[PDB]
């Protein structure tokens, strides 16, 4: 082409949106934003698809034009704003809060929470480096750039981030022994504990992560995101506690729910 | 117009290459600015990719030259081109390009060396202890000119910048200019 592309045809959309292949020719094209448009969920989907506060593309438009919806602390009018991992979606009119985290099946969930968990998010740092006049600052994987961090926060670490004062209020030093949620691949969502990290000079490094109930799996360092120091999380895990399972097991669970029903 | 594609080339085997595409603007070239050494100073802007700007120096007369052993940089005027390691015909036409060899005024650098009683002397005797001043760079001063090497891209930035030759690199061109 001779420039950018502004359309997203439905069959080409990320599979984890669960859009239906006959519901129309196009999909919502994720606007440029803090998340990488293949690991995001736009606002249109959250309202009309999941929450069903709307029935059409135009109805979700109106809702934002009343400004009921706030994302990550700030009011967003954009229809296709790219919400992502560990954002907060809050509707003060209804008085509800959500974190965005993954199913074990690797799909975003709106995890309902109180106000006290809305005050903060978690972010992993992309890099820490000097800048104008040697003033230290850090990149996150959320687009954010925080200047003047602890000299302890190195690359790949994770930070607590108050949305009111906006600076680092805590940080986890990414290393072996903490709990992590995976944000890509076939293992995305699966939480567990770093058991080993083997590096390879000139390539990606592999993380070894084990479910609380024994099952062992591996990803590459890109798709890893520490939640808490040690076994305990610093956020509320979703409806399933990050433990992925065989197809037989959920078959057993239904009939086990179908013997009581 | 001018293009930087590889399509018109022969494959490494030596075989022909067919043209499956037309020429693209993101692939263009522009014709040089073959910068002159002349007092009718002129630099002209270019609108390039991204809405950025470049400077074509067409005629240049003065430059910014560094004396590294002394860590002193002063503007001087460009006198003439004396050696060009690509093509003799750039010397004859007096064209300024990166790595050309040029003689410059030496007037600002003589006076800085002239500089550098009670308060002032008790530094000028601190200095004058480490003076070395190779006879090669001394003799050029007696001639009133300094051999220098351009180290900027005049057709790219619109400036003639460079450094006074010293040591081996001064010695090497001097044997050439003989």
């Amino acid at each position: 082409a001779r420039g950018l592309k502004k359309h997203l045809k439905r069959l080409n959309a990320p599979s984890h949106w669960m859009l239906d292949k006959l519901g129309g020719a196009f999909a919502p094209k994720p606007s440029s934003g803090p998340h990488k448009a293949r690991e995001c969920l736009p606002l249109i989907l959250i309202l009309r698809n999941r929450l069903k506060y709307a029935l059409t593309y135009r109805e979700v438009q109106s809702i934002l034009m009343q400004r009921h919806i706030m994302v990550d602390g700030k009011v967003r009018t954009d229809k296709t704003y790219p919400a992502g991992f560990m954002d907060i979606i809050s509707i003060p009119k209804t008085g509800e809060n959500y974190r965005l985290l993954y199913d074990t099946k690797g799909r975003f969930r709106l995890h309902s929470v109180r106000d006290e968990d809305a005050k903060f998010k978690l972010c992993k740092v992309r890099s820490v480096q000097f800048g104008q006049k040697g003033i230290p600052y850090l990149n996150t994987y959320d687009g954010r750039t925080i200047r003047y961090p602890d000299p302890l926060i190195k690359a790949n670490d994770t930070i607590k981030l108050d949305l009111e004062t906006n600076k680092i209020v805590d940080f986890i030093k990414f290393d072996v022994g903490n709990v992590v949620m995976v944000t890509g691949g076939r293992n995305t969502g699966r939480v567990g504990v770093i058991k080993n990290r083997e590096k390879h000079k000139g390539t990606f490094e592999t993380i070894h992560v084990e479910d609380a109930q024994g099952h062992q799996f591996a990803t590459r360092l890109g798709n890893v995101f520490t939640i808490g120091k040690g076994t305990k999380p610093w956020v509320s895990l979703p409806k399933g506690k990050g433990i992925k399972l065989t197809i037989i097991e959920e078959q057993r669970k239904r009939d086990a729910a179908a013997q009581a029903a | 117009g001018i293009s930087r594609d590889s399509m018109h080339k022969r494959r490494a085997t030596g075989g022909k290459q067919k043209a499956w595409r037309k020429k693209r603007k993101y692939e263009l070239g522009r014709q040089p600015a073959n910068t002159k050494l002349s007092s009718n100073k002129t630099v002209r802007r270019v609108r390039v990719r991204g809405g950025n700007v470049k400077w074509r120096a067409l005629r240049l007369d003065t430059g910014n030259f560094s004396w590294g052993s002394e860590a002193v940089t002063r503007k001087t005027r460009l006198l003439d081109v004396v050696y060009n390691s690509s093509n003799n015909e750039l010397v004859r036409t007096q064209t300024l390009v990166k790595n050309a060899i040029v003689q410059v005024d030496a007037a600002p650098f003589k006076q800085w060396y002239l500089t550098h009683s009670n308060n002032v002397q008790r530094k000028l005797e601190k200095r004058q202890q480490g003076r070395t001043l190779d006879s090669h760079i001394e003799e050029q001063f007696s001639g009133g000119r300094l051999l220098a090497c351009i180290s900027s891209r005049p057709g790219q930035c619109g400036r003639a910048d460079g450094y006074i030759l010293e040591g081996k690199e001064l010695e090497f061109y001097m044997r050439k200019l003989q």
Binding site: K201, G202 | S6, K9, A12, G68, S69, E70, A71, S85, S86, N99, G130, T132, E166, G167, K168, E169, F172, Y173
Partner: protein, 145 residues
């Protein structure tokens, strides 16, 4: 000197030969010391590269090139160009229908630093860099004769 064999005097960028204050004890590329670099990935800079006098802008250990991308091994096939060789890669290609293999090959031009020395049919490991000429994208890092 022997390096200086051209219509321009050859020098490394940002190494200042005529320095007022000098010290061999400082980092390479300072105080007049020859610049030399660690390529990474587990290769060792040869001594002739470190205490060399040649100038080569394309050398991995002293030039301006960065090794990144892929790392291939192969056999030197021809060493008749100025500071460039053709290395033959030998490999087997699976023919699915007949469940057998055939010997295919590829010829890859790679730049050779003056620090090494290659004869016809020597084991070389090359590393990928930016394009260095029309066909050269690789740089010789080891030579096992």
């Amino acid at each position: 000197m022997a390096e200086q064999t051209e219509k321009s005097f050859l020098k490394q960028p940002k190494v200042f030969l005529s320095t007022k204050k000098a010290d061999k004890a400082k980092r390479p590329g300072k105080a007049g010391n020859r610049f030399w670099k660690s390529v990474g990935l587990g290769f060792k800079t040869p001594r002739e590269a470190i205490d060399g006098t040649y100038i080569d802008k394309k050398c991995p250990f002293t030039g301006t090139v960065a090794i990144r991308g892929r790392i291939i091994a192969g056999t030197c096939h021809s060493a008749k160009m100025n500071r460039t060789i053709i290395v033959r890669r030998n490999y087997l290609h699976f023919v699915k229908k007949y469940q057998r293999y055939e010997k295919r090959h590829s010829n890859i031009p790679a730049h050779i630093s003056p620090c090494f020395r290659v004869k016809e049919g020597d084991h070389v490991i090359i590393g990928q860099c930016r394009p260095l000429s029309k066909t050269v994208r690789f740089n010789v890092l080891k030579v096992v004769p």
